[PDB]
Structure formats: structure tokens, C-alpha cells
Design a protein around this ligand. Structure first.
Ligand SMILES: O=C(O)[C@H]1O[C@H](O[C@@H]2[C@H](O)[C@@H](O)[C@@H](O[C@@H]3[C@H](O)[C@@H](O)[C@@H](O[C@@H]4[C@H](O)[C@@H](O)[C@@H](O[C@@H]5[C@H](O)[C@@H](O)[C@@H](O[C@@H]6[C@H](O)[C@@H](O)[C@@H](O)O[C@@H]6C(=O)O)O[C@@H]5C(=O)O)O[C@@H]4C(=O)O)O[C@@H]3C(=O)O)O[C@@H]2C(=O)O)[C@H](O)[C@@H](O)[C@H]1O
Length: 342
């Protein structure tokens, strides 16, 4: 009995359909009853901040139903101030029990074109993070099935609660899955993108930059997935599996890189092409204003039965025991939440 409460389409000759996704959401009755919106094939140039609990979007197809906007952290608003990383997001989830199925969410910020600009070009943005999807601390129990997330730097920002990504595609360059949330990814393609601006021998990017608090049991958990390159031009040993993001945070003794954001990234039964070289470090500013490096060996970076050309086992790539791997089942990672579609 999978009926829809609202239908969005590009055709006016469709029937009683909404022209925009924002207008379909608007039609939802107030409160927390389930509301399911069908989004017909088309490119919808909208930015959305979801504040209604129990909201569910279903695209006609992942290939054809697209929600897209172009905004970098360094893009200026009317008041001439920056959007910032969080502010750059095409879709922001600030409610509970959200789901999206069979659709694509993009940030269309043209990172390569930006990088190709002359250094003296005043329109060349330095703050190049451009978030496609941001699940916030108010967005617990967010479920994405057969969803594609497109971007370069900082594609997916996962913060606070639990999220589950299933049969998904996520693409990017630098820290394209990042944040402190519990985010489980199963049967996903994680696509490392070509970088025209990066010299031969230098690092093109990092799949993950977790900021998971040390007292949180689960961070970024990747299972039964495929870590792939976008093209043959993506060089061997050009991408890190993760680096430790210790976010700039305000404390009683000043504002600096969070010492306790000791991120977790775990890969289980995941294929990796040879663009992967291993884990890496990341720098921030400490309480004194000095550079401080956060090292992968000090972080919760683990693999279990990786395979494919990028799957080396070495001292620098710690491996879970079978008994440790059993701790990373969906049931354990997501606790009392079983992701379900309406
Ligand atoms: O509590 C809140 O909710 C909070 O929310 C806001 O905040 C968030 C965040 O919580 C804040 O801490 C802060 O975050 C900063 C930034 O916005 C965020 O994306 C992230 O950034 C990472 C690095 O710290 C940045 O320096 C930057 O990385 C650069 C390059 O951009 C990147 O390409 C790459 O570079 C390569 C090599 O790897 C380098 O070695 C070198 O050779 O250069 C090349 C190259 O240029 O190609 O890595 C470097 C680097 O490592 O420095 O981007 C990183 C990223 O993840 O993309 O963390 C920042 C930080 O910790 O300060 O702001 C966030 C925001 O939304 O603005 C509110 O603002 C806050 O008040 C509060 O409310």
C-alpha cells in the first residue's frame, strides 16, 4: 500500500502535482504523521532544510530525479558574508525519521573550474568545501536507500545521531564523508574523483574525515561496499581512506582543534582499487595557536577483510579480528533503530 501524499513533477499537464519539492513539503499537515512525496524525473534546483519529522522523499529513479544547487563555503550571501561549510549544503536534515530513496542530491559547485582560475581572479574561491547533504544533530534516524550524493570537497557531512546509507553512490575528493555522526554505509560505491589541480605524486583526497568523539562507540562504518576511482586518470596511491578531523571547537580555555574528536572509520568486507594508499594524518591549531598534527595510528582507523588492489595489510593498516568484526553488524551500529521505508 505504498501510496503518495504529494507528487512533484516538471509537467503541469501531469495532474494535481507540485512544481517544486519545497511546495510539496509545504502541503504536508503539521506534526509527525508520515508524509511521502514522489519526485518525478527532472533536475530540481532547490536548497532544502528539513524540519518536519517523519518526512519521506522518493524519486522516480536515482539517475533521473535530481536535487541540485551550487554553493561553496566561500560563496557570499547578500550581507557579503560566507555561507561556511555547514551553510553550503544543498540539503540539510534537521528532523528525525527522514528517508530519501531513488534520487540524487548534488552540490554543483564547479570545484575544478574554480581551481583552474588564475590566482589573481577575484572570483576564485579559497573555501572550496561544498556540501551536498548535511545530516545534523537534530536529524537522528536518517535513511538513504539507492541515493546518489555528488560533490568534490566535503560531499557528505554527518553529525550527531545515526544515519544509514544503503545501495548508495557517494562521490568526492577531499574529506567527502566527514563528521562526528554514527553513519553506516552498506553496499555503496564510494567514488574518488579525478583532480586536474593536483601534481603527480601528491595526494588527491581522502574518503573520510571522522570527528567522532572518543566516548562514542561508533563513527563511520563502511560495509560490503566498493571503493572505486571515477576514471583511469585517478592515479595509483592518490587517496587516503581517512584522516582524523579534530574540528575547531570553543572551550572554556579558547577556540581550537578538539582533542577528544578521535574519529572512527571502519571498513568491513569492502573492495578497494589501487588509488588507495592507506590512512593519513591531518593538522589543526592547538590551544596555543600552534600547528598540531593528528595521526592515523592514534585514531580509530580499522579494516576487516578488504580486497582488491588497494587492500594491503601492514602495520600501518590495522585489522579487526573476527570477534571484533562482529561488533560492526547493522544491529550493533544502529542500536534500537531499524531503518524502514514507508
Ligand atoms: O559546533 C558547531 O556545530 C560549529 O559549526 C560550525 O562549524 C564547522 C566545524 O565544526 C568547525 O570546526 C569549522 O570547520 C572548518 C571547516 O569549515 C571544515 O570543512 C573543516 O575543514 C578541513 C580543514 O580543517 C581545512 O583547513 C580545509 O582543508 C585544507 C584544504 O581545503 C584541503 O583541500 C586539503 O588540502 C591538500 C592537502 O591535504 C594539504 O596538506 C595541502 O598540501 O593542501 C592541499 C590542497 O590544498 O589541495 O586539506 C587542507 C587541510 O588539511 O588544512 O578543509 C578541510 C575539510 O574537511 O574540507 O574543519 C575546519 C576546522 O576544523 O576549523 O567550521 C565548520 C563550518 O561549518 O564552518 C560553526 O562555524 C561553529 O561556530 C560551530 O557552531
Amino acid at each position: 500500500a505504498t501510496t503518495y501524499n504529494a507528487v512533484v513533477s516538471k509537467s503541469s499537464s501531469d495532474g494535481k502535482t507540485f512544481k517544486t519539492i519545497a511546495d510539496a513539503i509545504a502541503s504536508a499537515p503539521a506534526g509527525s504523521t508520515p508524509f511521502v512525496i514522489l519526485i518525478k524525473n527532472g533536475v530540481y534546483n532547490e536548497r532544502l532544510t528539513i524540519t518536519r519529522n517523519n518526512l519521506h522523499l522518493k524519486g522516480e529513479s536515482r539517475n533521473g530525479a535530481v536535487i541540485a544547487a551550487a554553493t561553496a563555503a566561500g560563496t557570499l550571501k547578500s550581507d557579503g558574508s560566507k555561507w561556511g561549510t555547514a551553510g553550503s549544503s544543498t540539503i540539510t536534515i534537521s528532523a528525525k525519521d527522514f528517508s530519501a530513496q531513488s534520487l540524487t542530491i548534488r552540490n554543483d559547485f564547479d570545484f575544478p573550474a574554480n581551481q583552474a582560475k588564475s590566482d589573481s581572479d577575484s572570483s576564485k574561491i579559497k573555501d572550496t568545501q561544498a556540501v551536498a547533504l548535511y545530516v545534523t544533530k537534530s536529524g537522528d534516524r536518517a535513511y538513504f536507500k539507492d541515493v546518489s550524493l555528488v560533490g568534490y570537497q566535503d560531499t557528505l557531512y554527518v553529525s550527531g545521531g545515526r544515519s544509514f546509507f544503503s545501495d548508495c553512490r557517494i562521490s568526492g575528493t577531499v574529506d567527502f564523508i566527514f563528521g562526528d555522526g554514527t553513519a553506516l554505509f552498506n553496499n555503496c560505491d564510494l567514488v574518488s574523483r579525478y583532480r586536474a589541480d593536483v601534481k603527480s605524486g601528491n595526494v588527491s583526497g581522502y574518503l573520510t574525515a571522522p570527528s567522532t568523539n572518543i566516548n562514542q562507540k561508533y563513527g563511520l562504518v563502511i560495509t560490503n561496499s566498493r571503493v572505486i576511482r571515477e576514471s583511469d586518470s585517478v592515479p595509483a596511491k592518490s587517496y587516503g581512506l581517512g584522516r582524523p578531523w579534530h574540528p575547531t571547537t570553543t572551550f572554556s580555555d579558547g577556540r581550537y582543534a578538539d582533542p577528544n574528536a578521535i574519529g572512527q572509520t571502519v571498513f568491513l568486507n569492502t573492495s578497494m582499487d589501487n588509488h588507495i594508499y592507506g590512512w593519513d594524518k591531518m593538522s589543526g591549531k592547538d590551544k596555543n595557536g600552534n600547528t598540531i598534527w593528528f595521526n592515523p595510528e592514534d585514531s580509530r582507523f580499522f579494516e576487516y577483510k578488504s580486497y582488491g588492489a588497494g587492500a594491503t595489510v601492514s602495520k600501518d593498516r590495522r585489522q579487526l579480528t573476527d570477534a571484533q568484526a562482529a561488533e560492526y553488524t547493522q544491529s550493533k551500529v544502529l542500536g534500537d533503530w531499524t531503518p524502514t521505508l514507508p
